[PDB]
């Protein structure tokens, strides 16, 4: 139901509104408010995941709304192609940034309601365009500012829309 038109192709996402209600609603809102238009996948790590939704070209961090509670304990594993919320070490700090697993990453799953075990909340999955994710994951990257794994050439989310 969500379409991410990027300069590498279009990624279509299906959200799990019931299994991760607060997270799905938070994401959909950002899309609706056009917050993701013009953002990049600033952290691309082959064999791990691709993260975006927080920076504009030149690593310019956008403002966000208040954090959301962590819904990682919903029984959903960080399987290949699932989308989940990136965050601060603080479990309940997720805001606008998300990542798409490019590999089964069980280690990211909730194990306990503890600082280190809270895990990362899966709230959807790439329904169409997994090939787009497969290509993005292997693009050239390098360090910039206090960021590593930044794509040499910007991977841009031109527009995100609810369909």
């Amino acid at each position: 139901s969500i379409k991410l038109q990027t300069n590498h192709g279009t990624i279509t996402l299906k959200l799990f509104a019931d299994k991760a209600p607060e997270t799905a609603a938070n994401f959909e809102q950002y899309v609706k408010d056009g917050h993701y238009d013009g953002t990049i996948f600033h952290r691309v790590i082959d064999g791990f995941m691709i993260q975006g939704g927080g920076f504009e070209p030149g690593m310019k961090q956008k403002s966000t709304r208040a954090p959301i509670k962590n819904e990682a304990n919903n029984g959903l594993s960080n399987k290949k192609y699932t989308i989940a919320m990136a965050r601060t070490p603080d479990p309940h700090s997720a805001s606008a940034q998300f990542f798409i697993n490019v590999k089964d990453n069980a280690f990211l799953d909730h194990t306990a309601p503890t600082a280190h075990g809270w895990g990362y909340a899966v709230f959807g999955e790439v329904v169409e365009g997994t090939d787009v994710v497969d290509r993005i994951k292997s693009v050239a990257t390098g360090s910039r500012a206090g960021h590593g794994d930044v794509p040499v050439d910007d991977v841009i989310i031109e527009k995100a829309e609810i369909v």
Binding site: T88, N105, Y120
Partner: peptide, 4 residues
């Protein structure tokens, strides 16, 4: 910066 997470997940690490």
């Amino acid at each position: 910066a997470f997940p690490f």
